[PDB]
Amino acid sequence: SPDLWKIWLLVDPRRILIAVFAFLTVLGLAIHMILLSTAEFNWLEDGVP
Amino acid sequence: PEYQNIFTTVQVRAPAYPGVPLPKGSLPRIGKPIFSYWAGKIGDAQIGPIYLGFTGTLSIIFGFMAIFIIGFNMLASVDWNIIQFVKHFFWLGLEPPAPQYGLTIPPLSEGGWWLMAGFFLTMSILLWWVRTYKRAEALGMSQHLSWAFAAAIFFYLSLGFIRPVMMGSWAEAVPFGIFPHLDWTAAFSIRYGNLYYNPFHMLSIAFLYGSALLFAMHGATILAVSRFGGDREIDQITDRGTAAERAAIFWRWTMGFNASMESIHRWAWWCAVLTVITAGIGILLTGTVVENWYLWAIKHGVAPAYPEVVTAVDPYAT
Amino acid sequence: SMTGLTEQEAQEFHGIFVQSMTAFFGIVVIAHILAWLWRPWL
Amino acid sequence: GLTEQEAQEFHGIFVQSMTAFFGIVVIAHILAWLWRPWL
Amino acid sequence: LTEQEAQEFHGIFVQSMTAFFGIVVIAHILAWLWRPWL
Amino acid sequence: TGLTEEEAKEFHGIFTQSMTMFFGIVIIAHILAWLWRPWL
Amino acid sequence: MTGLTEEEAKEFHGIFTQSMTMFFGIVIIAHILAWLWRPWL
Amino acid sequence: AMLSFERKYRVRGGTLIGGDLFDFWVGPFYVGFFGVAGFFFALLGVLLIVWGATIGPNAELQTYNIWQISIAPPDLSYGLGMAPMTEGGLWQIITICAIGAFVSWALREVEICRKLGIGFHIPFAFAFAIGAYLVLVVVRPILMGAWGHGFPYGILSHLDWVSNVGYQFLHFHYNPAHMLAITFFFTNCLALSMHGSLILSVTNPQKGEEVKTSEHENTFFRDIVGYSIGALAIHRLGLFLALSAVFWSAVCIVISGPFWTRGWPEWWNWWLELPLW
Amino acid sequence: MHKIWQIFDPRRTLVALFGFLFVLGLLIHFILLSSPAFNWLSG
Amino acid sequence: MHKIWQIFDPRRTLVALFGFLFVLGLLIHFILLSSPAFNWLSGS
Amino acid sequence: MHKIWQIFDPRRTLVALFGFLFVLGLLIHFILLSSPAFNWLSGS
Amino acid sequence: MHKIWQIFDPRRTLVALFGFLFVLGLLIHFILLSSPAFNWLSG
Amino acid sequence: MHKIWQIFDPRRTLVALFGFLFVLGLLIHFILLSSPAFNWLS
Amino acid sequence: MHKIWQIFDPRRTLVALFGFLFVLGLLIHFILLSSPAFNWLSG
Amino acid sequence: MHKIWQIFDPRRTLVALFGFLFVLGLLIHFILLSSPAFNWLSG
Amino acid sequence: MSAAITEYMDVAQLTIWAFWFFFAGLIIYLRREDKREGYPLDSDRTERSGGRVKVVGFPDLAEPKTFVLPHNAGTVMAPRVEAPTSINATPVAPFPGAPFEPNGDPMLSGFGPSASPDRAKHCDLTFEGLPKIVPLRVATDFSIAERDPDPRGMTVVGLDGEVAGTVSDVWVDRSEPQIRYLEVKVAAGGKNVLLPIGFSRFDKKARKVKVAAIKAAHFANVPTLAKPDQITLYEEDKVCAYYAGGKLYATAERAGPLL
Numbered sequence A: 001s002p003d004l005w006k007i008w009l010l011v012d013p014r015r016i017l018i019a020v021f022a023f024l025t026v027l028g029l030a031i032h033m034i035l036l037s038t039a040e041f042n043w044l045e046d047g048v049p
Numbered sequence B: 001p002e003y004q005n006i007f008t009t010v011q012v013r014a015p016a017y018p019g020v021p022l023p024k025g026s027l028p029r030i031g032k033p034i035f036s037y038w039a040g041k042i043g044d045a046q047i048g049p050i051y052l053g054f055t056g057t058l059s060i061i062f063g064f065m066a067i068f069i070i071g072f073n074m075l076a077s078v079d080w081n082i083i084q085f086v087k088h089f090f091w092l093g094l095e096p097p098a099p100q101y102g103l104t105i106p107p108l109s110e111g112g113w114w115l116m117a118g119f120f121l122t123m124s125i126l127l128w129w130v131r132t133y134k135r136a137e138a139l140g141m142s143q144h145l146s147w148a149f150a151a152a153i154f155f156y157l158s159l160g161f162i163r164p165v166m167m168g169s170w171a172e173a174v175p176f177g178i179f180p181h182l183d184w185t186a187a188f189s190i191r192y193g194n195l196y197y198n199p200f201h202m203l204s205i206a207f208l209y210g211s212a213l214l215f216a217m218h219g220a221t222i223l224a225v226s227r228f229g230g231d232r233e234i235d236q237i238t239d240r241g242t243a244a245e246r247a248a249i250f251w252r253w254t255m256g257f258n259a260s261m262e263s264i265h266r267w268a269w270w271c272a273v274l275t276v277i278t279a280g281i282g283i284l285l286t287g288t289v290v291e292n293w294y295l296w297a298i299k300h301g302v303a304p305a306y307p308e309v310v311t312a313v314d315p316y317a318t
Numbered sequence C: 001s002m003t004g005l006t007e008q009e010a011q012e013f014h015g016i017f018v019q020s021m022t023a024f025f026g027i028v029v030i031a032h033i034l035a036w037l038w039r040p041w042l
Numbered sequence D: 001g002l003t004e005q006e007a008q009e010f011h012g013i014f015v016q017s018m019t020a021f022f023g024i025v026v027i028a029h030i031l032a033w034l035w036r037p038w039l
Numbered sequence E: 001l002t003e004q005e006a007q008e009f010h011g012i013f014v015q016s017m018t019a020f021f022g023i024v025v026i027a028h029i030l031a032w033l034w035r036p037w038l
Numbered sequence F: 001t002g003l004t005e006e007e008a009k010e011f012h013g014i015f016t017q018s019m020t021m022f023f024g025i026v027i028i029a030h031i032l033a034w035l036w037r038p039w040l
Numbered sequence G: 001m002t003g004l005t006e007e008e009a010k011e012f013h014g015i016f017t018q019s020m021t022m023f024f025g026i027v028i029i030a031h032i033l034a035w036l037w038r039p040w041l
Numbered sequence H: 001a002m003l004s005f006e007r008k009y010r011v012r013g014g015t016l017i018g019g020d021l022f023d024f025w026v027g028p029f030y031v032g033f034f035g036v037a038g039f040f041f042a043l044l045g046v047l048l049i050v051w052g053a054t055i056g057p058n059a060e061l062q063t064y065n066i067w068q069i070s071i072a073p074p075d076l077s078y079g080l081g082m083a084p085m086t087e088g089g090l091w092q093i094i095t096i097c098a099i100g101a102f103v104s105w106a107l108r109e110v111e112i113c114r115k116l117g118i119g120f121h122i123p124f125a126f127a128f129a130i131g132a133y134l135v136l137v138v139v140r141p142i143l144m145g146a147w148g149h150g151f152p153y154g155i156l157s158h159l160d161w162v163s164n165v166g167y168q169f170l171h172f173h174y175n176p177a178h179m180l181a182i183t184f185f186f187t188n189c190l191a192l193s194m195h196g197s198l199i200l201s202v203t204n205p206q207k208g209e210e211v212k213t214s215e216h217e218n219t220f221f222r223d224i225v226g227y228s229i230g231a232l233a234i235h236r237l238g239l240f241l242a243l244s245a246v247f248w249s250a251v252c253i254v255i256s257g258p259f260w261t262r263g264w265p266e267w268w269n270w271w272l273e274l275p276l277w
Numbered sequence I, L, N, O: 001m002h003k004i005w006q007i008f009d010p011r012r013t014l015v016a017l018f019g020f021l022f023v024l025g026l027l028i029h030f031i032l033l034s035s036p037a038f039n040w041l042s043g
Numbered sequence J, K: 001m002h003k004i005w006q007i008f009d010p011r012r013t014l015v016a017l018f019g020f021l022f023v024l025g026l027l028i029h030f031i032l033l034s035s036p037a038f039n040w041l042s043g044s
Numbered sequence M: 001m002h003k004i005w006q007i008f009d010p011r012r013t014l015v016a017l018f019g020f021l022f023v024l025g026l027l028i029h030f031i032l033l034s035s036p037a038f039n040w041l042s
Numbered sequence P: 001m002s003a004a005i006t007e008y009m010d011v012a013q014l015t016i017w018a019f020w021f022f023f024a025g026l027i028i029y030l031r032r033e034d035k036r037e038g039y040p041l042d043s044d045r046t047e048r049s050g051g052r053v054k055v056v057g058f059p060d061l062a063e064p065k066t067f068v069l070p071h072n073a074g075t076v077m078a079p080r081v082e083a084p085t086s087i088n089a090t091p092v093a094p095f096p097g098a099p100f101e102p103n104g105d106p107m108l109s110g111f112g113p114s115a116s117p118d119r120a121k122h123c124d125l126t127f128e129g130l131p132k133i134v135p136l137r138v139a140t141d142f143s144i145a146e147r148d149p150d151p152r153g154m155t156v157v158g159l160d161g162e163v164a165g166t167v168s169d170v171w172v173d174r175s176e177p178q179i180r181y182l183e184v185k186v187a188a189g190g191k192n193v194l195l196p197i198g199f200s201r202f203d204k205k206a207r208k209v210k211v212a213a214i215k216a217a218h219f220a221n222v223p224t225l226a227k228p229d230q231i232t233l234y235e236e237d238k239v240c241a242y243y244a245g246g247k248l249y250a251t252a253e254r255a256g257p258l259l
């Protein structure tokens, strides 16, 4: 799309920057929590190595 | 002491206010308004008029049918003895269907009457919700009350309909009685391993406690600044007076932060609403995704451990 | 005049309302005939 | 409050974004089907 | 709120409703082939 | 509304490139994670 | 607009990166030391 | 930092104790004499709780899990005397600090009320919550004869205390004052939702409408339930409901064990044994 | 008769009567469903 | 019979009717599902 | 029939309809997932 | 269809739709994780 | 140190000091009463 | 160091310092009283 | 780096910094006392 | 589907975490609503920065919402820019957080408990557009309840017990019928002044109105009304604030401390 840049005309770019960073941090924290909760992907309590 | 503004010392009488005119085509308000001196001592003297429209009429008719069925079955439970009805009234109840009936309709005295009372009461509550929605709409007002009522209805439906259907058993539902529904409340907690360890029960209590805390805070605050007209909160919202300022400044000095005259009512609205929202969620999670709340708490490291000063040999381990 | 509709307007609404109601009853009847063939209840 | 001309431009991009988002979704569902079919 | 807006809304509403119904029917036809419920 | 047209284009340039840099690091991390412990 | 001059943005960004990489460098050394101490993968 | 309208209210004086010694603000907070006393009462009590969590019930069970931290009262065998610090004495010290902090908070609120020239309803209302806490940790333990009857200081452990105290009377729902207090708690929550809704729906009406009036407010609940208590009286009612809930809750627990030792349902036998039936 | 609409509002009377009839119709159907001898949704 | 619409507003009568039919439809569907001889999600 | 939307606001009616349709779709999907005969995620 | 945006605001629709899609994606992922036949995080 | 009274008002300080001293004396007596080896009422 | 009193005002700072020191002094004594090896009141 | 004091108020920074450090010092000491391997008051 | 998300994760644990994220957003929303009044803050941080650092805390301020007033009284924005107002007081000490001492006669300073904002110079209106707070002599349909004494004629007594005046009329709220003000004929001057009901303690037996806020002499300086038969929102605040200043300023001992 040659006009994807128009997303920044309707919503303030500063709010997106903080919102995207806050959302990604939460999403990253949540996925790490989910993996730690699994016996298969817990890198702290697996004994390897 | 100084006037605490708890009781109206000198009451004022005016012609009864008919109410803000309703949109054209609406039914008139019924009841000739009267003035109660004792009601006017603590609040407003005027009693009535009331709007009883089409929706309210259906809610009343459905509601009476449910209430009549419950009271009739209570009377039948004491074998029609009206004297024994009065003696045992708190203990009497319309009791839900037996466990072996699942979700099917059982005979009248084996849960059939309970289902009818449950359905008719639910219909009347739902119709009453439409009435609260319509009354706000007829006055050009927003629907905050109907949302808050819907949240309470969500909890009510979770107790008697949604959870029993999810468990596939009307026997999970609440009896229609004073002590019987207290017995249900205790038995629910006992059956599912100490509801104290249900985190949404914890949240519901925090919001129920917070509702009392906030209304005590806000009620005392408004009375403390009512000498400046703080009771007239619409004025203080549109035109911030010294009452709103002193109210906010008191709380800022007390606890480092404050609300506004309008936003305190948003805190109040959400605190009360979240009480039944989390109550409904906690009920819906119990018995469906969690069997023993205490054991769920142990699994998630919520339950404290105590030193073993007393213990029992398990007779099943023989 | 408790609603504020003339004779033509109440008649006009009744003309379409009956048509919409009749069609709804038509689909309902078909649904019940199909339901009866699947599993009669009487 | 949004006029017609800027409405014409918005719908084109939104449809393109929806089509682009849909396409990724279709591939993921194809890959999921190959990994473990559900029906 | 006028005639040239209300009538315009109904037209697109119809072909959007029919599109939803058409997808819904195909979904139900496929659902019947997968697992008939009657 | 607020941001003009030219700075809207320019914002996309750093937005697209920085997001692409984040995406590339994500792909590398997921490639490493798959070699460490594949999940499918 | 954040009230900052356009030259302040250049000057802040430079110091921000220097402090960020210096912080990141200490972190990387810490993780190398932590990996040598007790690897987790 | 103060609110944009606050500076004209930051007046000297109105203290109960201290005069000008502590008459100042720290950030938003007013301090005064009871701000100093209350803060270091709270600070000491909080630190002792952390210390109580650091040693735990014992070294094996010690935990920093916020749900599981518990500072327990003494054993009942210690009676109304002082227990060793690791055997409930820390709980007794924290309780004293908590009372010091809570009362100082109430008295600091009184000084703020004097500064602002408002009614003393808020500190008076807060005294009810303090009174309920005093009933739980002082009045009831003294009536029973041991400090060990107080509830432990732990987010979940004090729920186990509430649970077991309730089942000391086999069915706590039948406690009459408990029933009254819950009715007030439930009614207060209903009244709060109603009051929050009415104010919000009047000041934030449907789109295209102006702010409504007090006439709308009276009409709305007259249209629903046939009665409107009024803009002033709803705050009287909310304060009354919340304070009555706590008063009757304090009554319900102080009669549970000091003034009633049987199961609570058995208390209703006075009504069941009336000679009318 | 014909004067029953002179002291009773047609609107309030009709919604009330239809409300009772609908509630009564529901109640009778519920009672019949509760009765094993008249449950038509059984085998 | 067409004059019933002069004592009941069509908009208010229509929304009340749409909700009433939806509740009635839900009620009947639930009764059938709750009746073991007519539950169509049992598969038999 | 072309006289339906002169009273109902297009925005409000779609908003109410879209929320209702999602809830009905969510409810039906969850009922089927709850019925072992139509659970497509159970393994068979 | 292009003329929909007359009533619906483009900006608030996007955040509402993206937020709706995000929680929908979480819900579907979590439902599959709850299914032993589709949980990809086990052995 | 006489200048401390130009920072802290003496008549106000005495009341604060009395409360501090009494509260400290109360605490020490209680701590001693909590210790069996120094409980003088045993 | 004497510029600090141009940053921190003596009246408020001294009140905070003395209370924090007294609470810290109380805490350490309480920690020692809780430690059997250093409880000087143990006898 | 002396320009950090042209963006951050030194008075509020020092209050925040001194408070954080005091809490951190208490926290680390408390953690060590909670571990029997490092409680220095055990004997 | 099932209750177990992973070996450890379960549905209830997910639900409670989902609430925490919603609740965090709700608290952020509520705090932003709280900050529609009195923000940005009046701070030394802003003062030394020359206004270049607005003190808002977290979360930042919300976009201004619109209150359309009835009867074309205007439109107010809840977050609004407010011009700084000078205070008729001076700091009692030069450190931050120090209180201010009012200048001149504290009862007349308009500072502390006697301070008030300048509200609109328009009367609060009933739903029909009439002034809401009016004397009984213009609200002729209003009356005192039979079981309660008529305030008119009662002797108004200041905090010291000395007679301050007599009650000429009663001002009532025409929307919610109740007393809001007592018109007092001041014994010294004779000029009528208003006395809010919140500062009036009725002695039914003695037919006396006791005002603990201010002395009898302080009644002469109560702010007066422009029009005799109505009161603006601005005047209401001025009158109530004046009596409140007496709770701290009227007597020297009211400043405190007790001991």
Ligand code: BCL
Pocket: A021, A024, A025, A026, A027, A028, A029, A032, A035, A041, A043, F018, F019, F021, F022, F025, F026, F027, F029, F030, F033, G041
């Ligand atoms: C479970 C198996 C592995 C593991 C598998 C993965 C996989 C797969 C991924 C990660 C990713 C991350 N892991 Mg890992 N990770 C593990 C254990 C850890 C542990 C730990 C103590 O155990 C920590 C602290 C981390 C931390 C991290 C983060 C660095 C990163 C996600 C941050 C984020 O949400 O950015 C979002 C927030 C932002 C602000 C991003 C900003 C984007 C900018 C514009 C791009 C340039 C960055 C710029 C310099 C700003 C600095 C921000 C940096 C992200 C620090 N992982 C275990 C050992 N981890 C993700 C990643 O690589 O993301 C980078 C990722 O895909």
Ligand code: BCL
Pocket: C042, I018, I019, I021, I022, I023, I024, I025, I026, I032, I038, I040, J028
């Ligand atoms: C033995 C059990 C039998 C059974 C035996 C009977 C018997 C006997 C009767 C019914 C009647 C009814 N049954 Mg059956 N019925 C059974 C199973 C069902 C099932 C089902 C899913 O199993 C359903 C949905 C129904 C539904 C119905 C309704 C159509 C009807 C009750 C309407 C009413 O209460 O009006 C009350 C509510 C109102 C609002 C009334 C007002 C109506 C409107 C507003 C006025 C319009 C006027 C119009 C011009 C005149 C025609 C009137 C029409 C009813 C519209 N039955 C089983 C199989 N059923 C009754 C009936 O036939 O009534 C018509 C009746 O006597």
Ligand code: BCL
Pocket: G018, G019, G020, G022, G023, G026, G027, G028, G030, G031, G034, O001, O028
């Ligand atoms: C496996 C467990 C290992 C361990 C492995 C690691 C690993 C891996 C890391 C640490 C890191 C840290 N560890 Mg360690 N650590 C252990 C045990 C400890 C113990 C203890 C009592 O046992 C303590 C107190 C610490 C404490 C610390 C901190 C010093 C540091 C985190 C700082 C931070 O969060 O900054 C965040 C907050 C700020 C930066 C705000 C402060 C602002 C400052 C003043 C900016 C100044 C600008 C300056 C000029 C440029 C930047 C330079 C740096 C700030 C120094 N560790 C054990 C033995 N530790 C991390 C680290 O090294 O970070 C630097 C890190 O990556």
Ligand code: BCL
Pocket: A001, A004, A031, D016, D017, D018, D020, D021, D024, D025, D026, D028, D029, D032, L018, L021, L022, L023, L024, L025, L026, L029, L032, L038, L040
């Ligand atoms: C169960 C089997 C598979 C699996 C099967 C599937 C299937 C099937 C699907 C996904 C989908 C997704 N999966 Mg998966 N997925 C699995 C496990 C994971 C794990 C994990 C840690 O285990 C993670 C983090 C993910 C993550 C994801 C997301 C990337 C994605 C859902 C995003 C969303 O909700 O949109 C909601 C939020 C938004 C829509 C916001 C908008 C974001 C985008 C960028 C919009 C841009 C529009 C357009 C592209 C703009 C550019 C246009 C051009 C310029 C012209 N999956 C397992 C292993 N997964 C879905 C997907 O592919 O969506 C992309 C999907 O259909």
Ligand code: BCL
Pocket: N028, O018, O019, O021, O022, O023, O024, O025, O026, O029, O032, O040
């Ligand atoms: C477990 C092994 C050892 C032990 C290992 C360590 C280690 C390792 C460290 C300490 C440190 C400290 N230990 Mg030790 N410590 C032990 C037992 C104790 C006991 C006890 C009763 O058992 C006590 C009371 C202490 C107390 C202390 C503090 C003096 C100090 C932390 C100060 C701080 O946090 O400042 C933070 C609080 C502030 C800064 C707020 C104060 C504000 C004031 C007004 C301004 C002061 C700033 C000033 C200008 C500059 C500061 C430095 C000056 C040159 C003095 N330790 C045990 C026995 N301890 C730390 C230290 O030495 O720090 C210097 C440290 O690194």
Ligand SMILES: CC[C@H]1c2cc3[nH]c4c(c3C)C(=O)[C@H](C(=O)OC)c4c3nc(cc4[nH]c(cc(n2)[C@@H]1C)c(C(C)=O)c4C)[C@@H](C)[C@@H]3CCC(=O)OC/C=C(\C)CCC[C@H](C)CCC[C@H](C)CCCC(C)C
Pocket: B209, B212, B213, B216, B217, B220, B254, B255, H038, H041, H042, H043, H044, H045, H046, H049, H094, H097, H098, H101, H102, H105, H109, H122, H123, H125, H126, H127, H128, H129, H152, H153, H154, H155, H156, H158, H242, H243, H246
């Ligand atoms: C009486 C009616 C309701 C009410 C009213 C009320 N509460 C009030 C007020 C009022 C009028 C205030 O003015 C005052 C306030 O300022 O609120 C913002 C307050 C207040 N009510 C609070 C809490 C609170 N109120 C509760 C209840 C109620 N408050 C009633 C339902 C509850 C419940 C039910 O649990 C709680 C938790 C505070 C937010 C605040 C008082 C703050 C205060 O006193 O601060 C000083 C003390 C500290 C900062 C910390 C002290 C720490 C101690 C030294 C150690 C810990 C001791 C404690 C026993 C630990 C127990 C922990 C376990 C139980 C988990």
Ligand SMILES: COC(C)(C)C/C=C/C(C)=C/C=C/C(C)=C/C=C/C(C)=C/C=C\C=C(C)\C=C\C=C(C)\C=C\C=C(C)\C=C\CC(C)(C)OC
Pocket: B067, B068, B070, B071, B072, B105, B115, B116, B118, B119, B122, B156, B157, B159, B160, B161, B173, B174, B175, B176, B177, B178, B181, I030, J027, J030, J031, J034
């Ligand atoms: C004036 O009245 C007279 C005198 C004539 C009779 C009065 C009698 C009296 C005094 C009755 C008193 C009754 C009392 C005191 C009742 C107390 C009730 C209490 C405390 C109830 C508490 C909780 C009950 C709950 C939460 C029940 C909820 C039930 C629900 C939500 C059930 C819904 C059921 C449905 C929707 C059924 C669905 C099945 C369908 C298909 C209908 O079934 C066929």
Ligand SMILES: CCCCCCCCCCCCO[C@@H]1O[C@H](CO)[C@@H](O[C@H]2O[C@H](CO)[C@@H](O)[C@H](O)[C@H]2O)[C@H](O)[C@H]1O
Pocket: H077, H078, H079, H080, H081, H082, H083, H092, H093, H095, H096, H147, M033, M036, M039, M040, M041, M042
């Ligand atoms: C606690 C909350 C705040 C309330 C303030 C008052 C706290 C308690 C008041 C101090 C009373 C101390 O009184 C003292 O108590 C201890 C502990 O029981 C008693 O000790 C006595 O009983 C304890 C246990 O019951 C025995 O271990 C001991 O052998 C015996 O001497 C002392 O004989 C008594 O002198």
Ligand SMILES: [Ca+2]
Pocket: A042, A043, A044, A045, A046, A047, A048, A049, G039, G040, G041
């Ligand atoms: Ca590992």
Ligand SMILES: [Fe+3]
Pocket: B218, B222, B233, B265, H195, H199, H235
């Ligand atoms: Fe209010």
Ligand SMILES: [Mg+2]
Pocket: B095, B175, B180, B183
């Ligand atoms: Mg029972």
